[PDB]
Structure 1
Amino acid sequence: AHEYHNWLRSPFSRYSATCPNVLHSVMTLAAMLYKISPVSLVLQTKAHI
């Protein structure tokens, strides 16, 4: 139960319950994985994401 030291917290389980079962949701889980960091931010925004 170490949710604060865990890598993947409760917002993922809450989103999973209301999931529509189409492949678009899978990429939505994949998209949420984007990192919060300086290098990740600059690379992400340089693509205009």
Structure 2
Amino acid sequence: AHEYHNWLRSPFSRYSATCPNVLHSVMTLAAMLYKISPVSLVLQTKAHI
């Protein structure tokens, strides 16, 4: 248990337990993992995400 050094913090496991199974929740588990790099930020905003 090195929770502040992992790459998946508490809200990922908080979100996995309460989701449905209609193949959109797997897309949300995917796209919660967009990084928060400045390069990731300019790439995300540069397509109006």
TM over 0.5: yes
Q: Normalising by the residue count of structure 2, what TM-score does the alignment of the two structures yield? A: 0.95
Q: Share of identical aligned residues, percent?
A: 100
Q: Provide the rounded CA distance (Å) in 2 between the counterparts of 1:12 and 1:22.
A: 18
Q: Normalising by the residue count of structure 1, what TM-score does the alignment of the two structures yield? A: 0.95
Q: How does 1:7-46 map to 2 (within 5 A)?
A: 7-46=7-46
**Deviation by residue 1:19-43 (Cα, 9 ceiling, x = unmatched):** 1011000000011000001000000
- How many matched pairs? 49
**Runs of at least 5 residues in structure 1 that lack an aligned partner in the other structure:** none
**Bigger RCO (CA 8 Å, 6+ sep):** 2
Tell me by how many angstroms 1:47 deviates. 0.5
Q: Provide the rounded CA distance (Å) in 2 between the counterparts of 1:4 and 1:17.
A: 20
**Runs of at least 5 residues in structure 2 that lack an aligned partner in the other structure:** none
